[PDB]
């Protein structure tokens, strides 16, 4: 089973700042990787498809890169509604698996 590791369960940031979350599949999953955002009491929302592609309606501050075994999710200028959970997922080989998630939180 491929393993996705999101080392930072939490990441401090500020509004107007820039952040980067990282993911590391145990194996090379090439480009078959997705990023999701989840807010409490809500279902995950697809943000990035194929390692670096935005999904539809997904804002420009959301970017993502990677293509191999290490992937990075990025937010150019963080807004108050981005202080949620971001999940990593590999869809290269079954069983499909997700990272443990990274929750962005405001530094104070």
């Amino acid at each position: 089973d491929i393993v996705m590791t999101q080392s930072h369960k939490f990441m401090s940031t500020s509004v107007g700042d820039r952040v980067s979350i990282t993911c590391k599949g145990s194996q090379d999953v090439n480009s078959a990787l997705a990023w999701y955002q989840q807010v409490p009491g809500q279902s995950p929302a697809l943000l990035i498809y194929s390692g670096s592609n935005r999904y539809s309606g997904v804002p420009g501050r959301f970017t993502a890169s990677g293509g191999g075994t290490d992937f990075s999710f990025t937010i150019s200028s963080v807004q108050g509604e981005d202080l949620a959970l971001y999940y990593c997922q590999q869809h290269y080989t079954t069983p499909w698996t997700f990272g443990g998630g990274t929750k962005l939180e405001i530094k104070r």
Binding site: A34, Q42, S43, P44, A45, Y49, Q89, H91
Partner: peptide
């Protein structure tokens, strides 16, 4: 893309 773009509310 086997990415899940549509989800039920749970």
């Amino acid at each position: 893309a086997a990415s899940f773009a549509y989800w039920g509310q749970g």
